[PDB]
Amino acid sequence: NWEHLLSLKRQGDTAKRLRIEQDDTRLGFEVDYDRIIFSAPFRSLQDKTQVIPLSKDFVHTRLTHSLEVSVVGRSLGRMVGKKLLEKYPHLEQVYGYKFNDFGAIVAAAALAHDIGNPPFGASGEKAIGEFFKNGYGKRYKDSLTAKEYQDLIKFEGNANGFKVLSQSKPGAQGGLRLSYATLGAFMKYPKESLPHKPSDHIADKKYGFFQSERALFEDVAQELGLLKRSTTDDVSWSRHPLAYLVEAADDICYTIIDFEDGINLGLIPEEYALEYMVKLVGQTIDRNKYNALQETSDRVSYLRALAIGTLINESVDTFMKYEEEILAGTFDQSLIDKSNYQAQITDIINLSIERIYNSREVIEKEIAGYEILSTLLEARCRALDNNDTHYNQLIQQLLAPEKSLYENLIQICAEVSTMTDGKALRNYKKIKGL
Amino acid sequence: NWEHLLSLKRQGDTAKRLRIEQDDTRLGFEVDYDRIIFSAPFRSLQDKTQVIPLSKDFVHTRLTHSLEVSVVGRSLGRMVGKKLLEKYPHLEQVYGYKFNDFGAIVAAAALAHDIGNPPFGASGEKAIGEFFKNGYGKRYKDSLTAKEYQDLIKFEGNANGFKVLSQSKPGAQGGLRLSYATLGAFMKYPKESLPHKPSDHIADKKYGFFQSERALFEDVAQELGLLKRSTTDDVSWSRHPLAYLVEAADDICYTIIDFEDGINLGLIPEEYALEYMVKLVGQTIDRNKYNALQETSDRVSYLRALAIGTLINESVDTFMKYEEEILAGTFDQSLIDKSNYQAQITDIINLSIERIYNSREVIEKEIAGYEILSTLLEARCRALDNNDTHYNQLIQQLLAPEKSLYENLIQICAEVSTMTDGKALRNYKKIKGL
Ligand SMILES: Nc1nc2c(ncn2[C@H]2C[C@H](O)[C@@H](COP(=O)(O)OP(=O)(O)OP(=O)(O)O)O2)c(=O)[nH]1
Ligand SMILES: Nc1nc2c(ncn2[C@H]2C[C@H](O)[C@@H](COP(=O)(O)OP(=O)(O)OP(=O)(O)O)O2)c(=O)[nH]1
Ligand SMILES: Nc1ncnc2c1ncn2[C@H]1C[C@H](O)[C@@H](COP(=O)(O)OP(=O)(O)OP(=O)(O)O)O1
Ligand SMILES: Nc1ncnc2c1ncn2[C@H]1C[C@H](O)[C@@H](COP(=O)(O)OP(=O)(O)OP(=O)(O)O)O1
Ligand SMILES: [Mg+2]
Ligand SMILES: [Mg+2]
Ligand SMILES: [Mg+2]
Numbered sequence: 039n040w041e042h043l044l045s046l047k048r049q050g051d052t053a054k055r056l057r058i059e060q061d062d063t064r065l066g067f068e069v070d071y072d073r074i075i076f077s078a079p080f081r082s083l084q085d086k087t088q089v090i091p092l093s094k095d096f097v098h099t100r101l102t103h104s105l106e107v108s109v110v111g112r113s114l115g116r117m118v119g120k121k122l123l124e125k126y127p128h129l130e131q132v133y134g135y136k137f138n139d140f141g142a143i144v145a146a147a148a149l150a151h152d153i154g155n156p157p158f159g160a161s162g163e164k165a166i167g168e169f170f171k172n173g174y175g176k177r178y179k180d181s182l183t184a185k186e187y188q189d190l191i192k193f194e195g196n197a198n199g200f201k202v203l204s205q206s207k208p209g210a211q212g213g214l215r216l217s218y219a220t221l222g223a224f225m226k227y228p229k230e231s232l233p234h235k236p237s238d239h240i241a242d243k244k245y246g247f248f249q250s251e252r253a254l255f256e257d258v259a260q261e262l263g264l265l266k267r268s269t270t271d272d273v274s275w276s277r278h279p280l281a282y283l284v285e286a287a288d289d290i291c292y293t294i295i296d297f298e299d300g301i302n303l304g305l306i307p308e309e310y311a312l313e314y315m316v317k318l319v320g321q322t323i324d325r326n327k328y329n330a331l332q333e334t335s336d337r338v339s340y341l342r343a344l345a346i347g348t349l350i351n352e353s354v355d356t357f358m359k360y361e362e363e364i365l366a367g368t369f370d371q372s373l374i375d376k377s378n379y380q381a382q383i384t385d386i387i388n389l390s391i392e393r394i395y396n397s398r399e400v401i402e403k404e405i406a407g408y409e410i411l412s413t414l415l416e417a418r419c420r421a422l423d424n425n426d427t428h429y430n431q432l433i434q435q436l437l438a439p440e441k442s443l444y445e446n447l448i449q450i451c452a453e454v455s456t457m458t459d460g461k462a463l464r465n466y467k468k469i470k471g472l
Numbered sequence: 473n474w475e476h477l478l479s480l481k482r483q484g485d486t487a488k489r490l491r492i493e494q495d496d497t498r499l500g501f502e503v504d505y506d507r508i509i510f511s512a513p514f515r516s517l518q519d520k521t522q523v524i525p526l527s528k529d530f531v532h533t534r535l536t537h538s539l540e541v542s543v544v545g546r547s548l549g550r551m552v553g554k555k556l557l558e559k560y561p562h563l564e565q566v567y568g569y570k571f572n573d574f575g576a577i578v579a580a581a582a583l584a585h586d587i588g589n590p591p592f593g594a595s596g597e598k599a600i601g602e603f604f605k606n607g608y609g610k611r612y613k614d615s616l617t618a619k620e621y622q623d624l625i626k627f628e629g630n631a632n633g634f635k636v637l638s639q640s641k642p643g644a645q646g647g648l649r650l651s652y653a654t655l656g657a658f659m660k661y662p663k664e665s666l667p668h669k670p671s672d673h674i675a676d677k678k679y680g681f682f683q684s685e686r687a688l689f690e691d692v693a694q695e696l697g698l699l700k701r702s703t704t705d706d707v708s709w710s711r712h713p714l715a716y717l718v719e720a721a722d723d724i725c726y727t728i729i730d731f732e733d734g735i736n737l738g739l740i741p742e743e744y745a746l747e748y749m750v751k752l753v754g755q756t757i758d759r760n761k762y763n764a765l766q767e768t769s770d771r772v773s774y775l776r777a778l779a780i781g782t783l784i785n786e787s788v789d790t791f792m793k794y795e796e797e798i799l800a801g802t803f804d805q806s807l808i809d810k811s812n813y814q815a816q817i818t819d820i821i822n823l824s825i826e827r828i829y830n831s832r833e834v835i836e837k838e839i840a841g842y843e844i845l846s847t848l849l850e851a852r853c854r855a856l857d858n859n860d861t862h863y864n865q866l867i868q869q870l871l872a873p874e875k876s877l878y879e880n881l882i883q884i885c886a887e888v889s890t891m892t893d894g895k896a897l898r899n900y901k902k903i904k905g906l
């Protein structure tokens with residue numbers, strides 16, 4: 039039920055924090071927002087790849103993408119919360135909740151939803167995985183549990199993001215110490231790395247936490263009241279209802295903005311821009327304003343602003359139509375896939391894949407990223423092995439100012455993923471002496 | 473005794489050169505000085521690392537360090553020689569020696585005391601060793617004698633310096649053909665590479681000659697009358713008395729100048745400069761002059777000039793107090809370790825280690841040096857193996873305008889150590905085509 043889903047608990051708490059005992063100027067979710075804003079992991083997003091590597095231009099990075107997702111998520115959360123308190127009046131009438139709380143939760147979750155991504159993006163994650171699969175790290179296969187090896191060979195940015203958010207350090211336990219509602223709404227694949235893709239459900243495409251933090255998530259999963267889907271030997275719970283909204287906001291934003299940026303770069307003609315969006319923007323377009331503009335940028339910006347407004351309302355309608363199934367855990371798709379504009383979205387995505395992801399420029403950067411990440415990971419792993427050599431001591435002093443082998447390897451992968459693109463490239467040249 | 477220690481013999485001589493038959497304008501030790509000054513190995517010291525690699529700035533290189541050590545050694549030798557001829561009048565009264573001869577010997581020995589060091593310094597030597605230990609060169613372990621392999625895996629700059637000084641070439645035997653007193657005073661570890669650190673004595677921390685020149689040193693060791701410390705299967709003699717003075721001069725100079733340069737660079741505050749040297753400079757400091765100066769450079773230069781003058785006199789006193797033990801071979805430490813200022817010296821050294829050697833700047837350069845040296849050594853060794861390939865012929869023509877395997881490997885290591893830092897880096901890029 040909804041009372042346990044909006045928990046204000048933080049790690050290490052003993053008492054019970056109640057909504058009616060909060061300070062209304064600064065609620066806990068706003069504190070979460072402010073704690074994410076002021077941290078270094080959030081700042082490192084400014085020079086991390088969204089689509090085009092090493093482009094910190096007029097193209098998007100992870101930071102600006104996260105900000106746009108935050109705005110869209112705040113809007114979605116406010117509408118859905120107003121409709122929910124309309125449906126269940128006891129929430130507001132007894133517990134003391136307002137529709138701004140839902141917006142704060144979704145905004146905070148959407149702000150930190152990519153905070154664990156490594157440099158170079160998808161190619162970076164695949165390179166980290168291939169290093170342990172077919173490279174040097176393969177030699178560790180026999181020393182590790184099967185699920186730990188699966189963690190290392192299918193490295194996921196979501197698990198690393200959870201690790202960053204809930205990291206324990208000497209003298210400061212809990213990390214950022216976010217609320218449990220925010221951690222639940224941030225969590226989109228509540229399962230371990232094995233088994234690999236059991237079903238066709240949407241919460242099974244990947245995994246969301248490592249083996250070193252499973253216990254932590256267990257605590258979270260038992261406070262919110264999430265339904266359990268497996269207890270044999272591998273735990274898996276159902277989604278928090280607001281993770282659907284977070285995912286919808288992320289999908290809308292990147293789907294539209296990638297097209298707009300590709301048009302502005304010179305890779306997609308504007309005829310496609312009008313053709314694939316006339317249906318989306320037809321219900322609110324004022325042709326006069328469209329015909330007055332004299333630049334491609336103004337036209338594409340107008341079209342994007344209209345399309346986002348249409349899609350947000352459609353998503354809210356879908357969520358309120360399937361609320362019961364979502365709360366019961368039986369809803370196996372995304373809110374976007376149940377929309378009237380699926381064909382247009384698929385056409386835009388296919389055009390983006392053909393014209394942007396496979397561009398020469400984009401390709402060369404990913405190959406360079408593969409080389410850089412492999413070099414840095416091999417250096418760290420060889421330093422971890424010997425430990426007695428002078429060279430090993432130098433590498434330790436440069437790249438790292440009692441734990442198990444799995445903990446050491448996962449820490450190595452986490453430290454590689456903190457770097458930006460430029461810092462990784464600079465370290466690569468310094469290692470090579472170039 | 474002292475008559476045989478000041479020998480004027482050169483390699484290949486048949487007759488006996490006597491001191492009273494010399495030309496007083498140009499004695500043999502001055503000829504040694506002039507022969508070292510005009511050679512190419514001495515010139516290559518201008519772009520070789522002392523502390524900070526690739527800094528040929530206002531920081532020291534090996535050449536300027538060697539010049540300062542030469543000045544301090546000349547002073548020490550003159551004082552000790554005057555006191556010795558005071559103690560033993562028969563030297564001057566019969567053989568015809570003057571106290572300038574001791575200064576000439578110590579100056580010539582201190583001028584060439586680092587002439588065998590490779591590029592990048594201590595990290596360079598360790599890289600050359602690690603190449604044979606854990607790298608490609610390990611494959612030769614089974615083809616070599618144990619002492620030869622120990623030579624190759626504990627590569628020493630002192631042995632390479634002896635090799636440079638006493639190198640035989642077609643048409644010119646003996647190399648620079650220095651006097652035997654100078655060669656003895658240059659020699660600080662008269663032993664082979666095995667056994668490794670037998671005792672806690674000071675002449676056992678390392679080794680001083682390779683297996684290809686052992687015979688040569690034997691000749692020297694039998695002309696001076698050095699005492700023998702082992703004859704089972706590994707030869708080891710005692711130190712020439714003036715090697716103590718050479719080592720004292722080297723220690724004083726680098727200990728003070730490293731601190732001064734670190735202060736001038738911006739890595740050590742000046743408060744430490746006054747705190748750790750007030751005791752050293754207290755007996756001769758004129759506060760008026762110190763308070764008149766208005767720059768950090770002038771103050772640190774004043775303090776250094778006072779400290780060197782104090783330490784020189786203390787070292788002379790220690791040498792004359794323990795002369796009998798030194799001549800008997802029973803003196804197991806250095807003249808610096810028997811001084812009243814050991815605590816201040818240790819504090820300055822520890823500060824230098826924490827603040828200069830482990831700086832980021834310093835660290836990155838050493839890692840690059842490791843990469844460069846490993847690449848060049850592997851290329852030379854692979855050229856030495858196959859010999860029939862076209863690529864091998866090209867590498868031979870580029871890097872080298874009937875001998876055993878050990879001779880070939882030691883010649884490879886000697887040719888790598890002739891390069892400066894810049895030349896090694898340029899060759900590395902040319903090999904990589906960058
Ligand atoms: N350059 C390049 N970019 C790609 C590729 N695949 C995806 N992208 C970029 C374009 C999208 O704007 C961006 C979205 O990345 P996400 O990790 O957020 O993807 P997704 O929504 O599938 O999220 P997920 O990790 O599955 O929850 O990734 C690719 O193969 N190459
Ligand atoms: N960058 C760097 N410099 C070092 C390190 N260790 C020593 N040095 C530098 C600082 C000293 O001024 C300089 C002295 O080198 P030497 O080879 O003359 O040393 P030492 O007096 O121990 O002579 P030795 O070869 O044992 O007779 O070496 C190190 O780990 N890193
Ligand atoms: N409903 C919404 N909620 C949140 N963000 C939105 C919404 N609609 C659009 N956005 C995003 C994308 C737009 O470029 C940007 C500004 O929105 P907005 O000013 O309402 O758009 P617009 O230019 O279509 O205005 P209008 O509807 O007044 O003509 O915010
Ligand atoms: N006794 C010495 N013998 C040889 N070199 C020395 C001696 N003392 C110092 N040095 C070195 C380091 C000094 O910076 C440099 C010049 O010495 P010097 O001019 O005597 O020093 P100073 O500035 O202390 O002079 P003074 O004693 O006249 O005040 O030579
Ligand atoms: Mg995102
Ligand atoms: Mg609008
Ligand atoms: Mg020296």
Ligand SMILES: [Mg+2]
Nearest residue numbers: 777778781782
């Ligand atoms: Mg003086």
